[PDB]
Every structure is written in C-alpha cells, then in structure tokens.
Amino acid sequence: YVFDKITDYTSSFIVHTPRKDYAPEGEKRVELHVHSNMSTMDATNSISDLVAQAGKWGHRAIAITDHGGAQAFPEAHSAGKKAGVKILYGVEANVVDDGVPIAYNDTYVVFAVATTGLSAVYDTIIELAAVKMSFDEFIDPGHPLSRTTVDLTGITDKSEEEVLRMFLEFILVAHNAAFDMGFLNTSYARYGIPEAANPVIDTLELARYLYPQFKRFGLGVLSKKFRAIYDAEATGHLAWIFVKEAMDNHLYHDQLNEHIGEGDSYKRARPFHVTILAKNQAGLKDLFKLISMSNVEYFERVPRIPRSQLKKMRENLLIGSACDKGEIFEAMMQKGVEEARNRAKFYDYIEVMPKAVYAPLIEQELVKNEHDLEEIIQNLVEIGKSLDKIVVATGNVHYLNEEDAIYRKILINSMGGANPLNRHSLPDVHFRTTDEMLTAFHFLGEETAKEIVVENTNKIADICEEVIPVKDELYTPKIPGSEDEISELSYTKAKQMYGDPLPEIIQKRLKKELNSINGNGFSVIYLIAQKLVHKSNEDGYLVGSRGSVGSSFVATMTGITEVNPLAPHYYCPECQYSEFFEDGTYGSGFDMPEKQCPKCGARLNKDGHDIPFETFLGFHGDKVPDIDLNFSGDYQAEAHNYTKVLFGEDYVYRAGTIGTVADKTAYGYVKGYERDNNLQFRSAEVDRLAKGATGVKRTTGQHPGGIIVIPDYMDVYDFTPIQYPADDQNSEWKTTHFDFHSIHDNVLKLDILGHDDPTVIRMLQDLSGIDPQTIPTDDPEVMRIFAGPEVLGVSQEQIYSKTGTLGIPEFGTRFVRGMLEETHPTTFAELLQISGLSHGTDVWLGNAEELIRRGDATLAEVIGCRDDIMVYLIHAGLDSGMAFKIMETVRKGQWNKIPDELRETYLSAMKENNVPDWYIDSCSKIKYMFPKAHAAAYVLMALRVAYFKVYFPILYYCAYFSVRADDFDLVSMCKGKDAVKQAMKEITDKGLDASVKEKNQLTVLELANEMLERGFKFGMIDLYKSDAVNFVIEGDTLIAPFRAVPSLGTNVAKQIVEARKDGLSKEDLATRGKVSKTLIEYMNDNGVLKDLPD
DNA sequence: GGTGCGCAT
DNA sequence: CCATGCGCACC
C-alpha cells in the first residue's frame, strides 16, 4: 500500500476490497464506544476517518466517547455531516464513588484471608487469620496452588465448613475490608451459614480519611509509615492506632461514617470507567459542565467526576458501564451477581464487549479461562434484562483496522512504567463490523446476540436526538454605546488632525469604514482593541500590530494602530492644512520631500501608505475585523487581566491548544520501541510507524496571546468545556477545552500577543526620555544603515555585514541582509517591499530576485505585499472589484488552481490595461503574500529602533542586550573585539550543522562585535552596580547583569540584588545570595569577587 | 534551568 | 533561501 514508500503491513520498502459490513441494510449495529486520537496517547485514528468508515459500512449512528474529554466533538460533527451518520456525543469519564463508608454494619477481631486470587466468585480462601484485640487456620483448595499464589502468599500445597464455623464463633476489622468481607461472606453462603453482619471496619478507608496527606494507603506502605497471620497482626497493630486517632482527633461505630465523601475524598478514591452520552442539547451542556468540573475541581492525575455530581446532572445523560474497568464488570468478576445487580441499578445501559477485548484479563489471571469470561458476560446480559436495562455490545474501539494496533502499542510503550497497559498485552480494539460483532457474541445465542448488537444499540441511538456541539453564528460581547463611541472617537481624532471640515478623501474613507463596521455589528471588536491599546499607552507601552488592522483608518483614528492607510499626504500640526497625493506618485507619505505649510510657517507632517481597507474588511466590508496586537512582553499579563476586568472573570478564558505527537516525537517513540523490543526496522517502515502514531493528542497548552471572550448573556458551556492548561491546577487562567479553531468563528479571540519590540522601545524611552512617537521615521540618515554600514562608523570587514541593520528587528537576519545588499532600499515604500519579499512565499527566490537583477522591474515595482497588487491594478485602470478578486487569487496562490475561464478573464483585463507581461508572470509564481499594513507596522518599529541605533548607539545596545539577548559568553565580550571575533569564527566553522543555542550565541556575538567596533565595550558584573536583568550604562561601557554570568540563575540573581541593599568575606555572598560555589568560582576567576578583600 | 519540540501570528 | 515568540515535556 502506498503510504507516501509502500507497505504490506509486514514491512515497508521504497520503490483492494475494503472491509465491508455484510449485515442487511436495516440490521446494522451502532458503535457506542469509540476512542479517537483525542484520547491522550491511547487511540490513533481521527474521529473523521472512524465516522467515514461507519458511514461507508451503513451504520446509522456512531458515538465519540474519548477518555475524559470532548475535544473531538467539532471534528466529529463535521465528519458526521459529511458522511450522513448521526453522532452521539459522549465521554469515557473516570468516576469516583463520592461516599465510600468506613463502617459497614452501622472487641475487635482484626482478620485477614490469604486466598487464590482476587475474584471472590471464581476463587476461594486458603488461609483465615484473625486476632481478637488468635485464630489462624489453613484451608486447602482442591487444586494445587499456582506458583503466583505460592509466591504472593508464602503458602505451598480442616474443611472450610469447619474453619468458617470456628471463625464465626471466634467488630470485624480488615484492610480493604470490602475484599475480605466479600470473601468471608461468599464462603459463608457456600455452606448456608449466616452472613454474620456484625459491625465492620475497613482500615483502608479509615487511613484515607484520617491521613489524607498520605499518597499510597496499601498495608505495607502504611505499616512502614506507622501470609494471612502476619497481615492480620499488622492490620491489628495499625487498627488500634487508627481507632485511637478517630476517637481523639475527631467514639462509636456509627460516627465513623458521619464525615464521608467530604473534601479531597475524590483525590484518594480509585476511579472507574463510566460512559456518559448526551441525550439532547441540554444534555450536551450538562456534559460540558461535567467535563469542566472534572478538569477544574476534581482533577487528580486524571479528570474525575464524583458520582454525586453525575447523579445531579443525569436527566439528559445516558450512563453506561463502559469496559472491564467499569464497576459493573469489576463487581461481576470479583464480587458476585448480587453486587453487580445493585451497582447496575445506577446505569441506563450495560456494555458488553467481545472476549477479544477482555483477553488481557485472562492473561493477568483476573479471569481464569474463557469459560469464566463467557459466564461473566452472560451474567451481565441477564442482570440487565432483570433490571429492564438496555444491554449493548460496544467494542471499545481504539483504532480503525486490525493492522493499526501496532501504532497504539508504540505509543503505549513510549510511556514505560507509567502506563499499566505495558504490563500485559493490548486487546483487539479495532472497529468491528456488524457481522464480526455478531460472531463475537454467538455464544449467547443468535437471538440474544442480534438483540444486544443491533436492536439495543439502535434503540440507544434513537433515544438521542440530533445534537450540535458547535454554534453557527458569531456571538460577540455587547458594550452599550459602542458604535457611537467608535464613530465619535474616529471623527474627533480626524477633526483634530484635519480640521473640522474634513477633506473629502477622509470623509469618504471614514464613512465607508464606519458603515462597514457599525453596519455589521463589529464595533465591539474595535472598542475592545481601543481600550486595550489605550490602557497600554497609559502605562507607557506602544502596541504594534500584526495582520491588516493598519489598513483601517478608523483603527488609526481610534488609536488602535500607528499605520496610516490614507494616500500619501501632508498635514499641518498647527493649522490643520492638508494635501493628498492620490495619483500614485509616492509610495508613502514618508518618501515625500520636506515641505512647509502654505497657510502658516509650520512644517508639514507627511503620512499615508496607500493601504486599502478592503484588505482588512474584505470587499463590501462584511469581513470580521481581526486585530492582533503585539503588546510588550512585560505588559501582556496586564492586558489579559484587563480583559478579565472588561468582561468578568467568568467570561474570559485563555485560548487552548492541543499539542499532538509530531514527526520528531513519533520518530523517537518508534526508535525507543525498536530498542526496547530489540528489532531492526527498515527506514521506510520506521517512517510508516512514525506516520501512524502521529497526530495523537499528547498534551494541552495555551495559545500565546489568545483570550476567548464569551458574551455575558451566555455561558462558556454553550460553546466549550474549560480546563487548566497542561492540567496545571495552579494556573491563574482557565483555557477552553476545545481547540480555538473550532470556536473562534463563534466567539471573539483577542490576540493579545507579546513582542520584544515594544519592550525595547520602552527601555529606550526610559534611558533617553525621548517619547517613542516623536521619533522621525522618515529620517534620511537612519536609511543609510539599510544601505551600508558607514553611517554606523564601521566597515563591512569589521562588522561581517554589508548592511548596518544588525539587531534591527526583521532586518538583521542574513537572508534579509542579503536581500538588502542586492536591492539597496532607500525609501519607506522599498522597506515595505523588502519585507513583503523576505517573508512571502515564492515572491523573491524565483519571482523577483531575477526580475530585479535583470532590470525588468525595480524593487519598488515588484509584487511585495498583497495590497500592492490591488493598488497597482486600480492605478492600471482595472475595476476595484476585478483587482480585489485577482489580488486574492494571487495571494492564495490560486493563479494556477482557478479554472481556465477565470484565469482568462483576469488576464484579458490586465493586458487590456497595459499591465506588463513580467507582472503577470510574477503573479503566476506566488504562493503566499502577506498584507501591507503588517509590513508598515513592523517597519515603523524597526525604524524607531534604528533611530536609536544610529544616534544613541550606547542606549540602543544596552536596550538590545537587556531585552533581546539572553545567552552571553561575556568572557570574549569582556575581553574585547578579538575574543568576540574568535568565538564568532568558532560558531561559523561549526557550519550549517550548529545548535540553536550556538546560533543565538552567534547573533548576540555579532551584535557585541558591532558594538565593540564602534568604541563601546562591555564590563564584568559588579556586585554593587550590576542589575538583576538589565545591562547598566556607565560612560561608554555596558555593565553586564548577573543573569549574563553562565548559570547565575534569575531568582538567585534578584537575591544578590536583595542582599546588596542589606549590606564581606566572600563567603557571606554565597551564604545570603544562595550563590552556588561553582558560580562563585566564576565571579572569582573573572575578577568579580576580586574586590572582596577577604 | 536548559533544551527540544509543537504551535501560532 | 521567513521571523519571532510562547508554552509544555523531558532531562
């Protein structure tokens, strides 16, 4: 089979009828237990392909019940709508019995019963020890003791009726008193002896209640902290202590049960599997609430649902017994039919899987043979008919086909001893057809098998109505007076900048933008962005932007963005005079020559970059505005908390991401598996096995800057469950359970990202007092750096770079530096072009490097950004509608993918208007192109930083190292230029195959070399001068911070800062600061502690 | 802490 | 031969 590389499922080398459901059309099964790759490291198939398989097989419905989550619900909805298959939305929850009594039957005979296994039904007592606080006896099973028993219990090969009578004549006490009491009572009933229901105590539960701080409550562990005979004396020696603690720290038997299931009880309980299915939409909301609470309130190494919570919310939730790890199967195989018929009273349907699923039980000795397994399954079918419950065969599907099992194994093997499944062999939990299931349950008879496989499953499916896990429309928050507020802000700023009578250009722009925004109900997005940016500016932080927000003039006037999308123009700061150039004569208003106001003597401010708003709001303005804001890294938490304030702590959630097994991790898993199992896989197989195990959920994290806001007239459970990122209960924010991609079309996702540029600019403003917004972004001298390194005062030979853009965001990279060297930009428009080429896909390597090198087009003419295509075509003479459509087709790399007719219309229109041939050839090769407003914002930040680099070199270098540089040698740096150059040469001679740490070191070293070439120098740390994290400026020298010293750590860094304000001996330092000898050794050889006179 | 590695704009 | 940045897993 071609999987990329061809495979026969036996091995893979480097160069068919599918499974069918043979049952009749109306007699198809419904699979009610399906695990997708969203079950963390358990299942390997996407819910989409399972739903597609069910659709092909003719199944009317299928259930998606993952282990503790609903993260496959949106994909399942899409797949069920594509395949015409009804989806039942469920979960495989770990339920913990809320109240497990300590005393059962409301002088102590602490007893114990070594036995022949764990199933009171299917094995029996071999020893019956007890101490009245002594009665010890051996019982002989007819069968010879298995080597397991001979070892677990130190017993090698009177009648019970007699030993049982002796013990009956002799307050019962036991560790795991349920297990011993069940064994004793079954033995009693075996001879018609009275049940002997005297008061009982389970020392396990008493220890759990009295010492919750403990982690494991087994007898050995507990015995340490504080044969049947030994077991008994041990329990007795404890039980005395436990009862004394119960009487003192908290006096009767009954009172031993008063405080049960209260507190962290969920944390110590042992969970069991239950299946929860939503019966209707309200059931789905209740299921989301249950998942959210199991993730947020009752999480202990897994999401847990206390049984009391599942009881409250079960009017719309079908509860099923799940698998052999469910409590009904556990009771029937280990406690008896009466305990299973009492537990089954709580379920709504009973699940029985094929004997192939249960094989690991027979391998683990839990079930002795296939006969016992058949008996257990048959009893469960009968118990269900007796209590009038639906009995269904489920299958416990974990992957699609029988050949996919290996993938699961590999994943499981990757967990080592963490996964209990690694002890035994995995079952056959592929997706079985109706005929396969009928065959697997033929030992119950054809009628019963056909009932529990086909009829009952379809009855369960019919019980549930159609459910929609994902909404259809967008629900934005409501802020009263938002449209009016946005209009007022925009017009007030426009009047202040361009006088009360606004230029007709500005009038038209504002009117169209505001009609698109307020008309579509998008004003709340603008208002939230405005508030966030306004609060950021008050705190003294500039907010940059990513994407196309800068294309909006309402975004400029409301203060959200610094990019002015108007046509190039002058305006007078004093008298409000303005003059626009809509003729395409200038790329930007920044490139316009200096001019003085005709009306008065003040100079004219030049602005405008000719960015249409259609790129942001789409043609017709119906598109949802998307405003990604690069707030400072320091201020990002403040912006998140401000969203919390704006909308309330219960309606804002950090957007959640699901991290899966990618190629690197999957390859590592396969390699570890083949090492442990000592095989030799062929590279192609290994690659097939890695592919099969890829995409499986591995963890959950948070989105970098995404806050999801829920309308205050709804609740989060109408959209998604919630959780803590990575299941960290100490997290300050809750994330959405669903991946944000499935919900961001229905609720607002505020991208409040963090960028180092606003941090660097804030530091530069602090170090110089210059206001960041007063910096000239049209300065000619600052563009000389983009040309060559001479403006800096150094040569190409000394800074190893042709361009002086080292350390300039988005322009200091070797690729971009090479492009700058080959193009020599000299204007803001050309800088925006350089950006659209350094970042686009297929825009420079084979489309424009050549056109520029051969003179076909200049840098200013080639296609750099997506807005440029529309601007050029509209200037060429095409209709705005034609250019918009063509600009979209090109930016999406669909020039070739569009039909012949469309390509034809576009080509005809362009050629009819004198659009060159090289321009259409370029369009043909472009895969992705990014917006003009994005480039304008990033170029404005880069120019603001470069201004300081050129005119305030010491301040710029201090800010860069303090904010952007994290890994410093500091030894070559402190030595001088020669050592820095030697380190750079070492990293360079390490070649293309160099570590990420080495590349970061090379970047910092390049910056340090450039700073040294210019006359500034770095200095070793000073205990009474260096800062914790920031470089200090002293003269023309940069004093390195403590964090710069290799491994000085950051917490201990602040420590030495805290200590130095309190007040010798060189030992005092290590003592207070918590300096590790090793780092003191560093500060000593490098001269730092030399000062110390000790 | 440090280092991958996955994810996102 | 895209840049930058965040967050969790694992050592």
Ligand SMILES: O=c1[nH]c(NCc2ccc(Cl)c(Cl)c2)nc2ncn(CCN3CCOCC3)c12
């Ligand atoms: O891949 C990306 N790289 C960058 N780089 C940042 C950048 C910085 C500066 C400029 Cl001027 C530009 Cl255009 C881009 N931003 C991005 N924002 C979104 N993306 C991903 C684009 N994806 C992938 C392709 O399909 C569209 C969605 C990216």
Ligand SMILES: [Mg+2]
């Ligand atoms: Mg015992």
Ligand SMILES: [Mg+2]
């Ligand atoms: Mg966004």
Ligand SMILES: [Zn+2]
């Ligand atoms: Zn599972």
Ligand SMILES: [Zn+2]
């Ligand atoms: Zn299960």
Ligand SMILES: [Zn+2]
């Ligand atoms: Zn299962």
Ligand SMILES: [Zn+2]
């Ligand atoms: Zn004027």
